[PDB]
Amino acid sequence: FVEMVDNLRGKSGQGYYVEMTVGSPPQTLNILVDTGSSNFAVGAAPHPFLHRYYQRQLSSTYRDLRKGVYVPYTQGKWEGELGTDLVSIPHGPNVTVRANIAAITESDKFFINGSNWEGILGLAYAEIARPDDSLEPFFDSLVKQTHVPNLFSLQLCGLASVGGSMIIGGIDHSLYTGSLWYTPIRREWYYEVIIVRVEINGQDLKMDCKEYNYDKSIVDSGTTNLRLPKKVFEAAVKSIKAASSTEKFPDGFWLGEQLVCWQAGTTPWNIFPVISLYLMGEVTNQSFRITILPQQYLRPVEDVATSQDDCYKFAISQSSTGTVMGAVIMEGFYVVFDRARKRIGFAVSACHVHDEFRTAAVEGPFVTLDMEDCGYNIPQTDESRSHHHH
Numbered sequence: 001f002v003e004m005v006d007n008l009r010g011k012s013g014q015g016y017y018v019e020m021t022v023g024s025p026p027q028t029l030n031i032l033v034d035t036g037s038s039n040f041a042v043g044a045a046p047h048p049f050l051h052r053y054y055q056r057q058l059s060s061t062y063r064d065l066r067k068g069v070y071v072p073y074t075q076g077k078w079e080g081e082l083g084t085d086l087v088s089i090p091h092g093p094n095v096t097v098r099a100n101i102a103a104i105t106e107s108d109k110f111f112i113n114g115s116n117w118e119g120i121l122g123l124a125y126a127e128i129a130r131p132d133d134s135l136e137p138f139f140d141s142l143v144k145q146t147h148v149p150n151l152f153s154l155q156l157c158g159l160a161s162v163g164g165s166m167i168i169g170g171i172d173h174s175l176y177t178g179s180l181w182y183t184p185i186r187r188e189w190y191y192e193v194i195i196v197r198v199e200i201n202g203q204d205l206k207m208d209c210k211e212y213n214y215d216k217s218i219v220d221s222g223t224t225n226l227r228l229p230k231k232v233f234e235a236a237v238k239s240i241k242a243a244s245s246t247e248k249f250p251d252g253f254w255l256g257e258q259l260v261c262w263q264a265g266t267t268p269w270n271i272f273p274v275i276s277l278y279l280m281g282e283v284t285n286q287s288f289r290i291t292i293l294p295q296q297y298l299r300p301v302e303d304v305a306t307s308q309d310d311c312y313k314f315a316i317s318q319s320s321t322g323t324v325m326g327a328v329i330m331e332g333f334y335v336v337f338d339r340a341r342k343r344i345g346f347a348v349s350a351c352h353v354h355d356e357f358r359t360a361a362v363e364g365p366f367v368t369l370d371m372e373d374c375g376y377n378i379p380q381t382d383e384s385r386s387h388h389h390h
């Protein structure tokens with residue numbers, strides 16, 4: 001898949017985008033790759049931080065669905081008018097499909113100054129599509145209309161410019177080394193997975209493993225940080241603080257709200273521990289671990305005021321909606337979203353993050369005799385229970 005290698009670009013902390021074309025004649029836009037949502041939505045009216053947008057009036061193939069959609073986030077919102085148009089990925093498979101498109105007509109805190117993407121490609125499953133699951137997501141239309149295999153893979157390589165690859169329909173062996181380990185997709189909504197054990201510099205956090213997946217764990221290219229449920233995040237911060245106790249940092253650093261700096265080239269990486277997340281294996285009683293270096297979770301931020309200094313932001317943060325394996329985790333790894341086989345694969349990425357003495361790793365198997373169920377069952381609302389799925 002040499003045509004798809006290197007088809008991602010981005011800015012540090014503003015995700016990764018792929019080129020897509022919409023309409024006829026083709027209007028090219030840069031579209032955020034988001035495995036944490038399931039709408040394809042594109043800016044479709046002027047905005048101060050956009051200089052291009054989808055012009056439905058210029059597409060002879062555009063059809064209006066005459067139905068609006070409103071998508072709130074805890075940080076902002078976008079809203080728009082649903083329709084369909086022809087869509088292709090110029091640096092992807094050689095096919096064109098008729099897909100649902102939400103034309104974003106207004107938004108708040110969604111498009112950011114200097115980001116360079118004009119829309120978002122929700123790669124997760126219909127269940128979480130807005131306004132409901134009857135709006136077929138892009139990848140579903142892609143696989144149904146063409147012979148593209150039902151799989152995609154992401155190599156996300158670490159404002160600074162970033163790059164990577166989204167291989168659509170395949171796995172490209174040139175983008176990883178060593179073993180590829182698969183963990184099951186627990187349920188097809190988010191790319192939900194189960195973490196069975198967490199270690200910080202080889203020391204077990206020794207929490208009940210349900211705490212790791214409370215109320216879910218998901219793989220999310222739309223999230224920057226590794227985000228951890230409250231109790232886990234506190235135990236992790238306690239452990240990382242212990243390891244790094246030669247350095248007393250301010251509270252704001254541990255909150256993600258303050259940089260910490262050393263003289264250029266002197267950062268003491270050795271005092272910051274590796275973190276290993278052990279993911280359920282395909283075989284009952286087996287897991288494998290993914291091991292993250294501090295260079296993945298301490299993100300450099302170029303200081304405008306101290307040229308002499310290497311400065312970093314702590315990129316692990318607290319969650320109340322479960323564990324989120326964001327860019328912090330993914331940047332280590334070639335991640336295969338094997339929708340056909342309901343599994344997610346992890347191998348060490350060919351764009352490796354370097355530490356002098358340690359390596360981001362994917363290792364297994366680890367066997368447990370004790371097969372505790374580490375999944376959490378989210379309390380069923382009457383709202384969920386009552387909707388019919390015909």
Ligand SMILES: CC1(C)Cc2cc(Cl)ccc2C(N[C@@H](Cc2ccccc2)c2nc(=O)c(C#N)c[nH]2)=N1
Nearest residue numbers: 013014015073075076077109110222223224225317
């Ligand atoms: C998918 C996308 C665009 C959805 C989104 C919507 C809105 Cl309105 C505001 C921010 C985000 C958002 N935030 C990401 C960072 C992002 C911005 C732009 C592109 C990709 C990622 C995020 N990551 C975190 O770690 C975090 C925390 N803690 C909070 N937020 N990601």
Ligand SMILES: [Zn+2]
Nearest residue numbers: 106107108109
């Ligand atoms: Zn507004």
Ligand SMILES: [Zn+2]
Nearest residue numbers: 050051052116
């Ligand atoms: Zn531009």
Ligand SMILES: [Zn+2]
Nearest residue numbers: 387388389390
């Ligand atoms: Zn019914």
Ligand SMILES: [Zn+2]
Nearest residue numbers: 133388389390
């Ligand atoms: Zn349904």
